Design a protein around this ligand. Structure first.
Ligand SMILES: Cc1onc(-c2ccccc2Cl)c1C(=O)Nc1ccc(C(C)C)cc1
Ligand SMILES: Cc1onc(-c2ccccc2Cl)c1C(=O)Nc1ccc(C(C)C)cc1
Ligand SMILES: CC(C)=CCC/C(C)=C/CC/C(C)=C/COP(=O)(O)OP(=O)(O)O
Ligand SMILES: CC(C)=CCC/C(C)=C/CC/C(C)=C/COP(=O)(O)OP(=O)(O)O
Lengths: 230, 228
């Protein structure tokens, strides 16, 4: 039975999860990190090659300032709780999006994890940060037109394959750029501008399970559902 | 209160036909009847646009006899559907790379477009020889040519500009993006259908096979959309 090579994950339901426990939304975001660690280690053992997680959308900047500040600080303060273990598990950490606009300490924590794990050959945990699909496509189409104008490439070179090489996912191995499966938790049956180009042919999987409750058994059920697809 | 633009991925024509001990092509003809029913009901309900995934770039991998039968459907059955849609004030349009279409198929579609071009009701938009990635790629060949000709600058390349170069540019600006995308036969994938335009769309999946999708099934989809 097939193991999806690349899984896209839209984490949802952290606030509802926390509220059921009479806790603020930020308590749910911390439990969301625990869930991501569990899922990453299990997927790596199962043979999944890439996990792209929708960590921070360009729309997430509209959340209350205190919540945005708390979120940006998570990889800074909890780096030791997760990154050395992912490294010991041979997991390679990467990121996609307009990351040059992340707060400096957040950008540094992510770059430090990337530099530490850059030679790792196991699962690639790919954080989509300051990411939007239409914006990603726009930056690709813009960079291509500039290259055509500079005569670095000619208009005859403009193909679907060329566009793929200018998307943020260009740093993933060529055969792993596109998710085989996209998971959205908390029962939301919608697209939220996550990998619209790369995920154009992806199998979709929706669960009512809130993201902090998504564990190894929930990942196994998603893979089982994926294997019953044709 | 209805979604203004509904995207429809018609699926299950073959399984529908097989349950009746009929070849897949029998299901495609019943699929046209279902589309006529859905279009007339959606128009009466106040839906502004229906974009139907009539023929994908992947559908060319089907057996030659089936592809030939499909391409002949609007040629052979034009009188069974087009005059009635026109009497219902439905405007017919198409999106996609329609140069690969056989001449008679392209002519039947253009004849329906010319007949209904002044109609002010629901726009029935056929995505034919369509693929989302190809649509975005063609938009770049056009944009790059304009940048090279100095009609525009690379600094003018924005999300708003890209939208004006997609095939959906012919729909009114506030109707280009589907509010809801429906896929029938319990298939959980979008298959390169409006990936840019549908980036924020509500999704609706049903086990109902497309030839069985009627007004009641459309009402259930609208009801589900309203609870979102
Ligand atoms: C689980 C887990 O495993 N590795 C990370 C991580 C990876 C890189 C740097 C720091 C951390 Cl803690 C991690 C994690 O959840 N990272 C994370 C958490 C939150 C954010 C915010 C900025 C959206 C960004 C990254
Ligand atoms: C229902 C319905 O109502 N009008 C049409 C129609 C629209 C344009 C031309 C001819 C026709 Cl029959 C129509 C329909 O099913 N058209 C159709 C059917 C099949 C195809 C193939 C080429 C995928 C293309 C268009
Ligand atoms: C990478 C990682 C593990 C990050 C930690 C989680 C985090 C801060 C995610 C970004 C915000 C978000 C979309 C949360 C999902 O729940 P929600 O707040 O939308 O929940 P709700 O819909 O119940 O309100
Ligand atoms: C516009 C219109 C009404 C056109 C007629 C229908 C038609 C020819 C559609 C194109 C092929 C297709 C994707 C059919 C869906 O059922 P399927 O053949 O994939 O069924 P299956 O999954 O059960 O095999």
């Amino acid at each position: 039975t097939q193991v999806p090579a690349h899984i896209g994950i839209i984490m949802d339901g952290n606030g509802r999860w926390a509220k059921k426990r009479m806790q603020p939304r930020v308590f749910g975001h911390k439990a969301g990190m625990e869930a991501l660690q569990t899922v990453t280690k299990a997927a790596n053992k199962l043979g999944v090659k890439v996990i792209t997680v929708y960590a921070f959308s360009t729309e997430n900047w509209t959340r209350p300032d205190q919540e945005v500040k708390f979120i940006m600080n998570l990889p800074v303060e909890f780096y030791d709780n997760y990154v050395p273990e992912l490294h010991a598990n041979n997991v390679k950490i990467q990121m996609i999006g307009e990351t040059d606009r992340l707060p400096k300490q957040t950008f540094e924590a992510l770059t430090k994890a990337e530099e530490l794990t850059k030679n790792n050959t196991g699962l690639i945990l790919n954080f989509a940060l300051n990411y939007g699909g239409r914006a990603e496509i726009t930056q690709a189409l813009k960079l291509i037109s500039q290259d055509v104008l500079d005569a670095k490439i000619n208009p005859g070179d403009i193909t679907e394959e060329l566009i793929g090489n200018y998307l943020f996912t260009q740093h993933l191995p060529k055969d792993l750029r596109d998710p085989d499966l996209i998971i959205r938790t908390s029962g939301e049956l919608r697209l939220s501008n996550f990998l619209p180009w790369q995920g154009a042919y992806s199998e979709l999987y929706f669960t009512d399970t809130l993201w902090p409750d998504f564990d190894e058994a929930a990942l196994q059920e998603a893979i089982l559902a994926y294997n019953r697809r044709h």
